[PDB]
Amino acid sequence: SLIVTTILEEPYVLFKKSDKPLYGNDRFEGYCIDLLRELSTILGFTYEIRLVEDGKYGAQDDVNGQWNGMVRELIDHKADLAVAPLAITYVREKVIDFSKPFMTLGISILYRKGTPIDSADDLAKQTKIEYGAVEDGATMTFFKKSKISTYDKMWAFMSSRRQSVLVKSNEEGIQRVLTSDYAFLMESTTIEFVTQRNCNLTQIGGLIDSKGYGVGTPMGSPYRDKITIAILQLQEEGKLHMMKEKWW
Amino acid sequence: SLIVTTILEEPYVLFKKSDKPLYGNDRFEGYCIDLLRELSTILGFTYEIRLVEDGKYGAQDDVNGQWNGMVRELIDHKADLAVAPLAITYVREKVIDFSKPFMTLGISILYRKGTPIDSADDLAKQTKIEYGAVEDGATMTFFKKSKISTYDKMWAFMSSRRQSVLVKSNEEGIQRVLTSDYAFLMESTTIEFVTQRNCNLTQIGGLIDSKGYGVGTPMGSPYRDKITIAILQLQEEGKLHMMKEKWW
Ligand SMILES: C=C(C)[C@H]1CN[C@H](C(=O)O)[C@H]1CC(=O)O
Numbered sequence: 001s002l003i004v005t006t007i008l009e010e011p012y013v014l015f016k017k018s019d020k021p022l023y024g025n026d027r028f029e030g031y032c033i034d035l036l037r038e039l040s041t042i043l044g045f046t047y048e049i050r051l052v053e054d055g056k057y058g059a060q061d062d063v064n065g066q067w068n069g070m071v072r073e074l075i076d077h078k079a080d081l082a083v084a085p086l087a088i089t090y091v092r093e094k095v096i097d098f099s100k101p102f103m104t105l106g107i108s109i110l111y112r113k114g115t116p117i118d119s120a121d122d123l124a125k126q127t128k129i130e131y132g133a134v135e136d137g138a139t140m141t142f143f144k145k146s147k148i149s150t151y152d153k154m155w156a157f158m159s160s161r162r163q164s165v166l167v168k169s170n171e172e173g174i175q176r177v178l179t180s181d182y183a184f185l186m187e188s189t190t191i192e193f194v195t196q197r198n199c200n201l202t203q204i205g206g207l208i209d210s211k212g213y214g215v216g217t218p219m220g221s222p223y224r225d226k227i228t229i230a231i232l233q234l235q236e237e238g239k240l241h242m243m244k245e246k247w248w
Numbered sequence: 249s250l251i252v253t254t255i256l257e258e259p260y261v262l263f264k265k266s267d268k269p270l271y272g273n274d275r276f277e278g279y280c281i282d283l284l285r286e287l288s289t290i291l292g293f294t295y296e297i298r299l300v301e302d303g304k305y306g307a308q309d310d311v312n313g314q315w316n317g318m319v320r321e322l323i324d325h326k327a328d329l330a331v332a333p334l335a336i337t338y339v340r341e342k343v344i345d346f347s348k349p350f351m352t353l354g355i356s357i358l359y360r361k362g363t364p365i366d367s368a369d370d371l372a373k374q375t376k377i378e379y380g381a382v383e384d385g386a387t388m389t390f391f392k393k394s395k396i397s398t399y400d401k402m403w404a405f406m407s408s409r410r411q412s413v414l415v416k417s418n419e420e421g422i423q424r425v426l427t428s429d430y431a432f433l434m435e436s437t438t439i440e441f442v443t444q445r446n447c448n449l450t451q452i453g454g455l456i457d458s459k460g461y462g463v464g465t466p467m468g469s470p471y472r473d474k475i476t477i478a479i480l481q482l483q484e485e486g487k488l489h490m491m492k493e494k495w496w
């Protein structure tokens with residue numbers, strides 16, 4: 001059986017609800033869990049789902065350059081696959097492999113309806129309305145590395161207020177939008193999940209960038225090409241879209 | 249020096265307009281030529297552009313399984329890279345490698361404005377308005393392989409009318425839309441190019457599927473992972489977006 005690392009994140013992975021105790025893979029459900037099952041159906045492997053111990057996706061430390069999260073598990077061969085809303089990025093692609101994307105997306109803004117704010121530029125040029133991102137994720141890294149004036153300005157604002165405006169999870173960011181005057185820079189797929197359930201919330205502007213989620217494997221893994229082919233098959237037979245419709 | 253296979257397709261690749269006759273790489277421009285130049289700078293290779301002799305992208309003969317087009321050139325090692333609007337598909341991925349996508353898109357419908365036609369199902373349930381696609385391309389292959397009722401029905405229609413509703417190029421399909429009662433099934437990125445320039449035309453419905461275009465390499469090519477990393481770099485620094493804006 002392959003060891004599959006993943007992390008709790010609605011509606012990709014959550015704990016299945018039951019009146020009775022649940023065990024093993026049966027404990028989990030969500031889009032990535034359905035995806036994993038479908039990949040299993042196509043490729044013929046068995047697997048054990050394990051939540052990443054440190055609760056992180058995968059970033060490199062500023063000082064020592066140590067990797068953490070699901071990415072680190074793959075690097076050290078403590079897992080065979082990572083199946084999660086894990087963004088395919090330049091810095092990650094240099095240390096692990098990714099399948100072709102099972103979802104395509106971009107950074108955008110979660111905020112409230114009915115305001116004058118219509119774009120990232122509107123946020124960048126003011127300070128009354130606070131804004132931020134999940135600390136150390138692909139979204140924050142985008143802003144940290146941008147040489148675009150607007151996003152450059154936004155990173156200056158965020159980094160000078162790290163403790164106060166950067167959050168530890170999508171959920172935290174979402175709650176802050178719901179309970180303070182705050183705009184949350186977050187991935188469009190997850191924004192769409194939220195706005196479908198909170199009628200007062202909306203995406204502001206369009207996508208700021210473009211990226212995919214891919215299944216991660218340790219570099220040199222034989223499963224990378226197999227998983228890519230299975231994802232393409234699922235895409236083409238319309239299964240990925242059915243799964244999205246199911247969970248969103 | 250790398251041999252790069254490509255094909256004329258506006259605005260991805262076109263003959264540069266000039267009084268003086270141009271030679272070698274100077275003949276060509278377009279989104280894909282910009283992409284090639286950007287890749288060349290990051291990875292440090294020189295190259296010769298060659299238009300694929302048979303003028304095809306790459307399909308399998310369904311009697312004998314032989315491949316054609318740019319896919320065949322890569323398989324036979326007659327080219328090092330294919331840089332074109334070449335869709336990443338299940339059947340092609342089994343025989344060549346693709347970089348991560350530099351553009352994401354989907355099949356949709358090009359038609360005239362002001363009709364009640366709102367979806368593929370609206371077309372499928374009638375026969376007065378003809379419809380078709382480029383013969384043997386990724387769009388056609390999608391319909392040919394689909395088990396979805398609406399799409400299977402559309403495939404029955406198109407395949408039985410093979411001689412009259414399937415075309416040899418996007419250009420031919422577009423002229424069909426302009427000059428008769430016909431809806432063209434084609435890739436959304438190309439539709440966007442067309443609708444921006446013909447105000448009487450529009451996209452009907454949304455995307456029917458999802459796919460990317462990627463750089464092709466012969467299977468096992470070392471350039472695959474380097475090209476993927478270069479694409480991610482171009483995407484993250486906003487260049488791919490500027491390239492699309494330039495050419496669309
Ligand atoms: C759930 C979060 C922490 C993850 C999910 N995808 C991004 C990633 O792969 O880093 C992170 C979100 C973000 O940065 O907006």
Ligand SMILES: C=C(C)[C@H]1CN[C@H](C(=O)O)[C@H]1CC(=O)O
Pocket residue numbers: 257305333334335381382384385386387388417418433434435
């Ligand atoms: C220009 C055409 C012939 C190509 C472009 N991409 C698709 C491909 O890679 O097959 C084809 C279009 C299509 O099938 O609608």
Ligand SMILES: [Cl-]
Pocket residue numbers: 098099100228346347348
């Ligand atoms: Cl890949």
Ligand code: NA
Pocket residue numbers: 092093094095096097098219473
């Ligand atoms: Na890699």
Ligand code: NA
Pocket residue numbers: 225340341342343344345346467
């Ligand atoms: Na391949």
